């Protein structure tokens, strides 16, 4: 991927991170298993997009996120939800850093 398409993918990823955080919050508030499932699916889609960047730290945090996701239809426990939000903030940090680094790269 050229740095420009990397930047486009990074913008998409950063937006979906906030979307997934919002869906996790809504699923915890409504206490519904279907909302949990929806949020986990959104997370899986985000992971599938994130893996295409072939960035090592991004892949590492994606693996952490996959570890923080519940199995299939199972809801996430409280500590698991907190761990999920933690890994999501970490992914947001590295995605923002990579966006900054790519924007620096395009400038010359």
Partner 1 sequence: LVPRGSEDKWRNAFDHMLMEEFEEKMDQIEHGLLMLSEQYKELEKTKSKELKEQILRELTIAENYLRGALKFMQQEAKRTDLNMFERYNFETAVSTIEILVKDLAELAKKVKAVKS
Binding site for partner 1 (CB under 8 A): 5, 8, 11-12, 15-16, 18-19, 30, 32-35, 37-38, 41-42, 45, 73
Cα–Cα distance, 74 to 98 (Å, whole number): 33
Query: Least distance from C-beta 15 to partner 1, angstroms?
Result: 5
Nearer to partner 1, 60 or 66 (CB): 66
Nearer to partner 1, 2 or 60 (CB): 2
Q: Is 71 helix (H, G, I), strand (E, B) or coil?
A: coil
* Cα within 13 Å of Cα(41), Cβ side: 8
Cα–Cα distance, 52 to 59 (Å, whole number): 9
Nearer to partner 1, 19 or 59 (CB): 19
Query: Least distance from C-beta 96 to partner 1, angstroms?
Result: 14
Cα–Cα distance, 73 to 85 (Å, whole number): 19
């Amino acid at each position: 991927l050229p740095d420009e398409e990397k930047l486009k993918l990074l913008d998409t990823l950063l937006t979906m991170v906030e979307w997934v955080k919002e869906l996790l919050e809504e699923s915890v508030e409504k206490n519904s298993r279907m909302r949990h499932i929806r949020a986990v699916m959104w997370a899986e889609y985000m992971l599938e997009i994130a893996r295409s960047l072939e960035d090592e730290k991004i892949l590492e945090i994606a693996e952490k996120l996959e570890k923080a996701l519940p199995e299939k239809s199972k809801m996430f426990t409280k500590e698991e939800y907190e761990k999920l939000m933690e890994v999501l903030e970490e992914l947001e940090e590295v995605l923002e850093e990579k966006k900054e680094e790519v924007e620096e790269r395009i400038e010359g």
